[PDB]
Write an enzyme that holds these catalytic residues in place. Sequence first.
Site, PDB file in Angstrom:
ATOM      1  N   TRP A 186       0.886  -1.262  -0.142  1.00 12.15           N
ATOM      2  CA  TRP A 186      -0.044  -0.069   0.036  1.00 12.15           C
ATOM      3  C   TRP A 186       0.664   1.436  -0.112  1.00 12.15           C
ATOM      4  CZ3 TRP A 186      -4.583   1.702  -1.689  1.00 12.15           C
ATOM      5  CH2 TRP A 186      -5.072   2.859  -1.116  1.00 12.15           C
ATOM      6  N   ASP A 211     -11.174  -5.148   4.735  1.00 12.35           N
ATOM      7  CA  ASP A 211     -12.506  -4.618   4.564  1.00 12.35           C
ATOM      8  C   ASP A 211     -13.391  -5.325   3.768  1.00 12.35           C
ATOM      9  OD1 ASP A 211     -14.545  -2.703   5.148  1.00 12.35           O
ATOM     10  OD2 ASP A 211     -13.310  -1.063   4.244  1.00 12.35           O
TER      11      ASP A 211
END
Length: 489
Positions: free
Chosen positions: A131, A269
């Site tokens: 990320w 998520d």
Amino acid sequence: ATAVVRCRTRLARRVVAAVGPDGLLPAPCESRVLESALALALLTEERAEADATARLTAYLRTTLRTAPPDPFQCAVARAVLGDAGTALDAGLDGFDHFTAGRKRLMFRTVLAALGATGFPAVPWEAYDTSWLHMEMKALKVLAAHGTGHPDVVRDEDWRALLPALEPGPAWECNNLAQLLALLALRHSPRHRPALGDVLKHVAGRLRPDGGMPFIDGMTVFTTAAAGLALSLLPAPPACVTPMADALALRRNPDGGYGFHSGVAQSDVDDTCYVLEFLRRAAPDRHRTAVAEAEGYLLALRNPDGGFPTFARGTSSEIAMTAAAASALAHDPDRREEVDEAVRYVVRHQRPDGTFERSWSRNATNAVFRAVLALTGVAAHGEERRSRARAAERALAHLAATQNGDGGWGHAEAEPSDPISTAYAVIALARGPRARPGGPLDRALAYLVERQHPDGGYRSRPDQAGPRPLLYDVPALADVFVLLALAHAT
């Protein structure tokens, strides 16, 4: 039936209709000033795609005049159309997050790469970090060239940027990362043979308004959350099966899910929404995908009992930890991990009852995810008391900050919006039964009033990325209001 049930019914019909025969709910991302400004800068520097750059310029001027974004993105647009520290401070005002220091470096270096401020006088290692790895490498390269030290750049920095030279849509559906990488790579003679063809693909992405979106879309997240909402209705529609199929056949080799088709990076998520939906709609049909998703989550769990978003050893996050607790609690064999996760959530609650802002810019998102874990996971005796007290403080925070119109905004004094309110409703549906004039009754009446004649909802967006910058996937407004109404009825 009640006004609330009629609202729920009209919204469910609209969400079902929006799902295609391939099982997916389309979820495009709207144009964003940051990526539009970077695409304009890149195409201008390369003297390329004049029709596109004229449309980008017009988009930026229109957006600044009519719907200006946060002060950082405004400063970015002004830098390319033509102070910086005031925008950076205002744009990162009270950004309470573990990424705040890296974000300050990232955002200041973006402004410097566009000529708006000087480059940070930091050791080059300050850029060193999946990320944001490509973004930070591209920014390191831009800083070395922009300060007049191109020899600093190592072959291992260029290597990290190679996916940006691949044809077609951006790697990992991320236009920001590709644009920053191309702004860096255009300084390298050895990488320039690949640049011309990628600039055609970049220019091809402009939306009808002339702008560039942050990402190609968010169909996996949106389909999973919509499937979950539909599966909580009294009689779920038949389309939950092709939706479950469409998600399961997109799982990554590690068992998790990314946010859109063609995203190879899984995250907690997305995986929790997919798992919650599959558990309800297809636990036997997709038994193997369920097990693989549980295994994915268990392999990420940090030693403090919390869960990160992407990778073990990065910071645990409250909302991801609560989401993982709820998704894993369906299996009695995982009770130890679930209870350690819920204990993490209680331990990190703030003195005022709130939790955190992370992937959403309202406080009510993490409140709902925490309250579902605190009230849904099985618990008795003293641990039940501890979790009840924590849930009570979170629901009391909602009642204390509810606006006069019955809704909530992104913070205590902001105007109400349907998504922030939908999250509060999911939480309040775990408190006392609705009573005339009470907080949940009024929140539901706020949502009834905000329904559009076409059955849907239009809302200011709440999603952040890179945090804390907002981006707008408008399909999420209907989905999260439906999730709220399904929980509350």
